[PDB]
Amino acid sequence: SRKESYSIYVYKVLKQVHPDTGISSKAMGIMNSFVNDIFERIAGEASRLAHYNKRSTITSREIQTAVRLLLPGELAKHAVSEGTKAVTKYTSA
Amino acid sequence: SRKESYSIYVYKVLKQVHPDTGISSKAMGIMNSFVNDIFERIAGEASRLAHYNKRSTITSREIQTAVRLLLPGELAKHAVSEGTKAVTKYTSA
Amino acid sequence: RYRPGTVALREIRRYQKSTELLIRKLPFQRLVREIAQDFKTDLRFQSSAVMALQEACEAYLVGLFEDTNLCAIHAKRVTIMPKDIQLARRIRGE
Amino acid sequence: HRYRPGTVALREIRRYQKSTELLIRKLPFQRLVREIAQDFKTDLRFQSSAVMALQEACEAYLVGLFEDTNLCAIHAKRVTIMPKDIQLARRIRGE
Amino acid sequence: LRDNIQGITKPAIRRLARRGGVKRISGLIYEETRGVLKVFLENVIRDAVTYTEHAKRKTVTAMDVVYALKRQGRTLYGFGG
Amino acid sequence: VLRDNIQGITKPAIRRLARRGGVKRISGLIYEETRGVLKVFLENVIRDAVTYTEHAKRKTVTAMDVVYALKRQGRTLYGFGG
Amino acid sequence: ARAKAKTRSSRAGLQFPVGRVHRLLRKGNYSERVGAGAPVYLAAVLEYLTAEILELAGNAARDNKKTRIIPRHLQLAIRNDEELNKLLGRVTIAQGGVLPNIQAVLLP
Amino acid sequence: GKARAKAKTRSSRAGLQFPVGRVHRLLRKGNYSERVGAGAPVYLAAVLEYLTAEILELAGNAARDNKKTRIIPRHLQLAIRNDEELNKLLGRVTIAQGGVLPNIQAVLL
Amino acid sequence: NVKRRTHNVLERQRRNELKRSFFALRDQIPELENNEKAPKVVILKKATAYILS
Amino acid sequence: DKRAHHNALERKRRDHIKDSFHSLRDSVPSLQGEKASRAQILDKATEYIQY
DNA sequence: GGAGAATCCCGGTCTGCAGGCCGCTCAATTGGTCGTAGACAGCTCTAGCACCGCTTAAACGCACGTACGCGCTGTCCCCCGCGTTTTAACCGCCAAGGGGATTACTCCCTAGTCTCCAGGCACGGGTCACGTGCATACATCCTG
DNA sequence: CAGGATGTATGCACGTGACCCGTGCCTGGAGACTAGGGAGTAATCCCCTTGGCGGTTAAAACGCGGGGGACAGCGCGTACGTGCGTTTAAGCGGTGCTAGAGCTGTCTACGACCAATTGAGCGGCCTGCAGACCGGGATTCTCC
């Protein structure tokens, strides 16, 4: 029996963001559900965008558009920058 | 160059509900918007119900449950009765 | 001359019975295009797209004015005021 | 000595907004959930976590309602909340 | 199990109003509040039991509550999901 | 260049909107307030309709892009598509 | 079960197209597999709701001495019916207008 | 951007902590589309990680302000409701055991 | 506008009366007994023929 | 253009109909030489066929 | 300015939970083939835009009066703070068993393929309903 | 009271837009068949929930006094409503030009799919630390 969660990555990100600071299991559960919800929103909107067009594939364009739609104000700009940077580094060399 | 619509079935139902009453083109466009919205609601909710239960298959049980969840009051009980009758009749031969 | 507020009731009935759009079309086209230009330049609009925007935005303002009325009545007034709009939007979450 | 009417109300507001506790007693809330469940399917078992989730949701919902209700009272130039305020809050909210 | 809505005492309503920032509570608020709460609970529990019944379980799990609240536009974080 | 067309939302137009909504008397400041509200609402719908248009690499905003923006905000619209 | 003309709609007794509803359930990726009775049940539901609205819209049309359904009638049919108003309460209807209602405090 | 570090794991190859593999698996099994492009999970993992970093930064600030070393749900709620963009992103969300901001209105004082 | 509306509805009822007259004439002619959809020109011409016969 | 042609076809239809009415009027003795409405021509044709 | 109660700071105590380590299974990664979705070039034609003149309804500016909104006052009732008494939640503990979780096995229904035909679509033709303007007949007011 | 000028009510002829019917054509749906996987069933185990017990306690209920607030009435002055004449821009019909949407046809680059190899990370365990809790005192807010 097994169950998979994002808690290990939440912990790593916290260790980078505030290196001396811990996180209680309840906060971990909330962060885990936050990751689940945001994933579901972006994937749902990317699906809706793919299906609004006559397109079978979810690509980084569907996701960039979905992030511009879903996130408010500055948060969209920074998230779009992060996504673009990651795909750039990943496809580079 | 073609695109499909529910207008013909809307009109047949109209004639069976009221023996003599016509419908305008704008009202017919509204009815098509309605049919597509209700379909998307039920089909989407049925997706949830299958996914939550680790099932790959949308069955009558999922649609029935989606109807109970989506429709209020009397509409639920009667929609379920109508759907059950249609499936039983369809299955009888 | 009629008692003040009488012609308002006549108007309420007239406009609730009718279905045509209340805001003039050419001004709303200019408004929509002016707003759109802030997001992207050189956009064309489908003739029906602006009609969808009128239908939705005008129906939204009708709905907001209806709630705006309730706030004034709760405060024991007849006259609606900016506080009513702000309360309605605050409770709605706009 | 006696604190003036409203002083202790402000002290309570400070206290409870500083806290994060559940404000309804758990056991009678659980009995309420079970009473309501007897309408929908006789003889269910409830996970303890499901009762906690229900209670947290209800308390969060009612606190939100009371914030909106306080606005309705204040807009009416009144300190005291009344059913008119709750009904207006819900009607504007669309319930 | 009957009359358990009385388990929601006036102080519980008053404390919830204190978190709501309320200074004074008229006496009709308590009855109105209980009516509003009971409606909310009935809706949430009916949906949770619907998920339970579809899954052929006899046990309501926290996930049923979460999936009920999601459909109301009220996403809840903390109990899984 | 289109500028200041929000003034085209006239006092009579706002008055008719309110009367249809059941309003009997209208304060002189409601016109200033309602224009602001309408501008906010239009911005939020048009931003998304443009975003759909831009995603699709189109230059013409369609009625379907508007309907999708409205469906997305929970203010679904019938008669312009579905 | 008396009727048995061979279209799946006709076998079910429905006016709505079962084959089309089956395509639409397979598309959109609602799930990996779709049961044979799924589009039948769903078509029956869509037809029932369609008939309910058309019934009330015809009643509204007769109340206005009209022989034809127009958007105004659809709006009235929905907004004067609690179940449909809850189902479609978010929905704006093109050229539908609004209910004829005035608050009592505004009247003499 | 930053120079490539050689690695097997797609996260390490993308410069991310979040798991590109698990995000890809969830996109494929979740029925979101018939097909999922190779760059899609990389973009999505970067977005999820960024948002996670924002919340944890604000929450750690709130924890320090409360003179405590571990983030707890109260700090998450404080972090959300004091930031306008996060409060717009999470406006409908209820956070278990978060409480509320200390809202006392001036007319009461 | 009430005057214009009144003239229009009166003429509309006159059109309904004329339709009753056409349908009465149509139903009188056995060749058109089942042909309820018969157009005005056909009713007139076939009525003329039937009358002469 | 095609719209104006359809209007022309409809005009021609009504012209043929007025000719048909004139023929029918002349066919019923109760209206021969008389001035009458289309409703009267139809009603007298009806009651004359009955008679 | 004084007496009193609520809140905070400080030190000391114990505990449950957080955090790190080990072995391990299962999901992630690698390398290649295969078929398809999508990118791209090219062409046709509709829908959108710009501009004009003309007729007309809707908005604008102005003057005028009073229903209403606001503030002030007096009154009476209702809710809070408090003390005393009563009630049930909470906590810790135990026991019984039902029902959630898991595996192993079998059968039935759904996905996919190929063939063929029927229902629905786009289009054109004919009929119909409706609104507008002209000619005719009927009723009211003015003159003597 | 009779006749003319005017207003009112009626019937007839015309143009515009919409609806209903019929024809030919193609895509889409159904029928027959197959192979494969998913879901249904039985058997099993353990976890969690249900129920009950005892004692302690905070928290609930109640009554009372009292103060502060909710409510109705009154008068003043303004901002708004309501009506007119002038000005403005909308709405309509018409003409022409062109951007882009929409479609077809060709081809390559991409992800699905598979088998084989491997490590990140999951589950359980041990260990120590930040948190909650208490007692004691001083500082700050509240009521006179």
CATH at G28? 1.10.20.10
Parallel, antiparallel, or unpaired for β F25-26 and B22-23?
Answer: unpaired
Reported as half-sphere exposure (CB side, CA atoms, 13 A), residue G29 has a value of 19
CA distance J6 to D8: 85
For C84, nearest residue in chain D (alpha carbons): D75
- Chain J interface mutation, best of I48, I50, I52, highest count of J Cβ atoms under 10 Å: I48
How many angstroms separate the CA of residue B1 from the nearest CA in chain G?
A: 18
CA distance B17 to F5: 48
- Which of chain A's residues have a Cβ under 8 Å away from the Cβ of H79? none
Residue with tokens 């992207």: C40
> Does C1 reside within a domain?
no
Looking at the DSSP assignment, which residues form a beta bridge with residue A58? H36
- Range(s) of the domain holding residue H60: 10-108
CATH classification of the domain holding E18: 1.10.20.10
Question: If you count residue pairs, one on C and one on G, with CB atoms under 8 Å apart, how many are there?
Answer: 37
CA distance I51 to J24: 9
- Collect all residues with Cβ–Cβ distance below 8 Å to A70 and sequence separation of at least 6: A41, A42, A45, A76, H89
Is C88 in contact with D92 (CB distance < 8 Å)? yes
For H31, nearest residue in chain G (alpha carbons): G29
CA distance H14 to A91: 8
Cβ contact, residue pair D92, C70, below 8 Å: yes
Amino acid at E45: I
- Which of chain D's residues have a Cβ under 8 Å away from the Cβ of C88? 92
Specify the CATH architecture of the domain B6-92: Orthogonal Bundle (1.10)
Instruction: Count up the domains in chain F and report the number.
Output: 1
CA distance D16 to H99: 9
H or E stretch covering D21: none
CA distance C61 to C59: 5
How was this model experimentally determined? cryo-EM
> Does F10 reside within a domain?
yes
Give the helix ranges, DSSP H, for chain C: 6-17, 25-39, 47-74, 82-92
Tell me if chain J has a CB within 8 Å of the CB of I2: no
Instruction: Count up the domains in chain C and report the number.
Output: 1
F39-53: burial string, b at 16+ Cβ within 10 Å, e else:
eebbeebbbbbbbbb
> Does E78 reside within a domain?
no
- Which of chain D's residues have a Cβ under 8 Å away from the Cβ of E44? 54, 57
Instruction: Count up the domains in chain H and report the number.
Output: 1
For E21, nearest residue in chain H (alpha carbons): H104
Residue E3 falls in which region: left (phi positive, over 0), alpha (psi -120 to 50) or beta: left
CA distance F38 to F50: 18
CA distance E76 to F3: 44
CA distance D52 to J37: 84
Tokens of G30: 């609602």
Is H23 in contact with H47 (CB distance < 8 Å)? no
Tell me if chain C has a CB within 8 Å of the CB of F65: yes
Measured from the Cβ of residue D17, the count of other Cβ atoms closer than 10 Å reads 19
B56 SS3 class = coil
Q: How far is CA A86 from the centre of its chain?
A: 12
Q: Does the nearest atom of strand K lie within 7 Å of J13's Cβ?
A: yes
- Range(s) of the domain holding residue F34: 5-73
CA distance A47 to H32: 5
Looking at the DSSP assignment, which residues form a beta bridge with residue F26? C80
Cβ contact, residue pair A52, F52, below 8 Å: yes
Q: How far is CA D14 from the centre of its chain?
A: 17
How many angstroms separate the CA of residue F81 from the nearest CA in chain B?
A: 6
Q: Does the nearest atom of strand K lie within 7 Å of H71's Cβ?
A: no
Tokens of H29: 């099994």
Is G54 in contact with B13 (CB distance < 8 Å)? yes
Cβ contact, residue pair H97, D63, below 8 Å: no
Parallel, antiparallel, or unpaired for β F60-61 and C44-45?
Answer: parallel
> Does H103 reside within a domain?
yes
Q: How many residues does chain E have?
A: 81
Is F41 in contact with C55 (CB distance < 8 Å)? no
Pick the CATH number of J2-50 from 1.20.59.10, 1.20.120.450, 2.30.38.10, 4.10.280.10: 4.10.280.10
Tell me if chain G has a CB within 8 Å of the CB of F73: no
Q: Where are the domains of chain A?
A: 6-91
Residue G65 falls in which region: left (phi positive, over 0), alpha (psi -120 to 50) or beta: left
Pick the CATH number of A6-91 from 3.40.50.170, 3.40.1360.10, 3.40.50.720, 1.10.20.10: 1.10.20.10
Q: Where are the domains of chain J?
A: 2-50
> Does E77 reside within a domain?
no
Amino acid at B20: D
Is I19 in contact with J39 (CB distance < 8 Å)? no
| Closest listed residue to residue B39, CA positions, set H32, F65, G24, G93 | G24
Which DSSP string corresponds to chain H? --PPPP-SSHHHHHT-SS-HHHHHHHHHHTTS-SEE-THHHHHHHHHHHHHHHHHHHHHHHHHHHTT-SEE-HHHHHHHHHTSHHHHHHTTT-EETT--------GGG-
Measured from the Cβ of residue H108, the count of other Cβ atoms closer than 10 Å reads 16
Question: If you count residue pairs, one on A and one on F, with CB atoms under 8 Å apart, how many are there?
Answer: 18
> Does G1 reside within a domain?
no
> Does F82 reside within a domain?
no
Tell me if chain D has a CB within 8 Å of the CB of E74: yes
Tokens of G10: 């006709």
Cβ contact, residue pair A30, E77, below 8 Å: yes
Nearest neighbour of D72 by CB, restricted to C67, C74, C76 = C74
Q: Which nucleotides on strand L sit less than 7 A from a protein beta carbon?
A: 9-21, 27-31, 38-40, 48-50, 59-61, 66-71, 79-83, 89-91, 99-104, 110-112, 119-123, 130-132, 142-144
Looking at the DSSP assignment, which residues form a beta bridge with residue F77? G92
> Does H44 reside within a domain?
yes
Instruction: Count up the domains in chain I and report the number.
Output: 1
Question: If contacts are CB pairs under 8 Å, which of residues 12-41 in chain C contact chain G?
Answer: 12-13, 16-20
- Collect all residues with Cβ–Cβ distance below 8 Å to A45 and sequence separation of at least 6: A65, A66, A69, A70
**CA distances in angstroms from A77 to A80, C35, J7, listed in the order given:** 5, 20, 59
Is F67 in contact with F77 (CB distance < 8 Å)? yes
